[PDB]
Structure formats: C-alpha cells, structure tokens
C-alpha cells in the first residue's frame, strides 16, 4: 500500500508493506544512534524476499548507509524496495528558521 511514518513517545515508527508475505510490518527506530543501514538491514532480514533495498533523496541522489537517521527524517525520501519506489513524507518538526540555521551551521563549522 503506502509507507507511513508516525511519532510515538518521541520515536519514529515506520509502517512498511512487505512484498513476500504481504502484511504491514512496523519498525520503530532510535533517532540518534541508528543509521540508514541499520533500517535497511532490518528490512532486508525481516522478510528475506528483498534482494535490493535503497533510500534516495527526493532529487534523485541516494543517501549512504552511514548517514544518521535524524538527518534523514527532515525532508521526504524515496524507499526503493525490490522494484518499487514508495514515496515517504515524514511529519515536519518545530525547527530553526533558515537564517538562524545557517548561523548555527557557520558557528559549528568555524569552531
């Protein structure tokens, strides 16, 4: 069907339809210590019919498997499972403005 992301107890919960067994499985993820690769190999070891799985940015490029997941869950992404690109749209957060985030980024790269 579709891939939904909801926040429960401050943690992201992704509910994915799996190809082989065709039941909606659910993966709850720690937003700091987990990675993209941890979620991908939990998907890949879940139902075993997935031979290729990948996560792409919405402008075409793919994110690496060492990218943290709190960097992933800010924008939309595409989850490619085995043939099919599901488009995932996470809930937007309470954030910094685009002028304060550049200032904090410049401080973090200037120290």
């Amino acid at each position: 069907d579709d891939v939904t992301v909801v926040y429960q107890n401050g943690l992201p919960v992704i509910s994915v339809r799996l190809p082989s067994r065709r039941e909606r499985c659910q993966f709850t993820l720690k937003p700091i210590s987990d990675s993209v690769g941890v979620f991908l190999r939990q998907l890949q070891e879940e139902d075993r019919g997935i031979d290729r799985v990948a996560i792409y940015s919405p402008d075409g490029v793919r994110v690496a498997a060492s990218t943290g997941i709190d960097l992933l869950l800010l924008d939309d992404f595409k989850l490619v499972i085995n043939d099919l690109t599901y488009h995932v749209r996470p809930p937007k957060r309470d954030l910094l403005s685009h002028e304060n985030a550049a200032t904090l980024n410049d401080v973090k790269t200037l120290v």
Partner: protein, 55 residues
C-alpha cells in the same frame, strides 16, 4: 577547547548513558549466580553468631 566541548557534550553523554545502562544490566546478570551462593554462607554465619549471643 571549551568552545568545542559544549558543541560535543550532549550527544556524548547519551552514548555514555546507554553504555552505562548496558554495562549495568550485564553486571547484574553476571552477579546473580554468585548472590544465591553468598546468601547461603551468610545464613550459617548468622546462626553461628546467634548461638554465641544466646550462650
């Protein structure tokens, strides 16, 4: 150094927190076989002490 430390101290003290919780729940399971042996030595040693206190 003090400017870098405050940039990297709250994500450090979460990794240390979960490593402390994991080591605590490993040390408890490593201790728990020895505890039931320790209680049964401190039960004879307290009965031999109440024999002195009553005698």
């Amino acid at each position: 150094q003090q400017l870098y430390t405050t940039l990297c101290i709250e994500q450090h003290q979460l990794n240390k927190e979960r490593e402390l919780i994991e080591r605590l729940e490993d040390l408890k399971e490593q201790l728990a076989p020895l505890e039931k042996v320790r209680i049964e030595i401190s039960r004879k040693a307290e009965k031999r002490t109440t024999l002195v206190l009553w005698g």
